[PDB]
Amino acid sequence: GSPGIPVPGKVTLQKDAQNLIGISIGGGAQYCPCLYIVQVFDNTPAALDGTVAAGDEITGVNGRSIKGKTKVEVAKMIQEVKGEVTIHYNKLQADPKQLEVLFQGPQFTLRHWLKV
């Protein structure tokens, strides 16, 4: 599908020594907005050449959206693609009200996120 995302983009990298990208995915926190990527490690492909760092909207893995399956499965999808890595991302300016919501500052929402 296509929900009309702002500015879509993709960066292609390759798996880390740990067989991942070096990120953490949560499908939104406060009101479950978007974001997906909650944190990254600078020396991971994701951060380093990737720049899919904390605050970016990783909406798809290697061309296929993650928003449709399951946390555990999406990490698997990324581990599945052995040796390679591609991230689809977006960048929402939102509106003041929704911008601070997308910002994620209030950390009352713990939840159980995923990581690769």
Curated annotation (Swiss-Prot):
Domain of life: Eukaryota
Residues that bind Zn(2+): C32, C34
Positions of modified residues (Phosphothreonine): T70
Subcellular location: Cytoplasm, Perinuclear region; Membrane; Postsynaptic density; Synapse, Synaptosome
Effect of K69E: No effect on lipid membrane binding
Tissue: Ubiquitous.
Outcome of swapping C32G: Decreased lipid membrane binding, but no effect on peptide ligand recognition
PTM remark: Phosphorylation at Thr-70 appears to inhibit the interaction with AMPA receptors.
Span of domain PDZ: 10-93
Annotated coiled-coil segments of the chain: none
Subunit structure: Monomer and homodimer. Interacts with CXADR. Interacts presynaptically with the glutamate receptors GRIA2, GRIA3, GRIK3, isoform 3 of GRIA4, isoform A of GRM4, GRM7 and GRM8; with NAPA and NAPB; and with BTG2. The interaction with NAPA and NAPB disrupts the interaction with GRIA2, conducting to the internalization of GRIA2.
Function: Probable adapter protein that bind to and organize the subcellular localization of a variety of membrane proteins containing some PDZ recognition sequence. Involved in the clustering of various receptors, possibly by acting at the receptor internalization level. Plays a role in synaptic plasticity by regulating the trafficking and internalization of AMPA receptors. May be regulated upon PRKCA activation. May regulate ASIC1/ASIC3 channel.
Description of its domains: The AH domain mediates binding to F-actin. The unoccupied PDZ domain is probably involved in allosteric modulation by forming an intramolecular bridge with the AH domain leading to a 'closed' formation. Binding of a PDZ ligand, such as GRIA2, allows enhanced interactions with F-actin and the Arp2/3 complex thus enhanced inhibition of actin polymerization.
Protein name: PRKCA-binding protein
Species in which this protein is naturally found: Rattus norvegicus (Rat)
Gene coding for it: Pick1
Residues of the full protein shown: 19 to 110 of 416
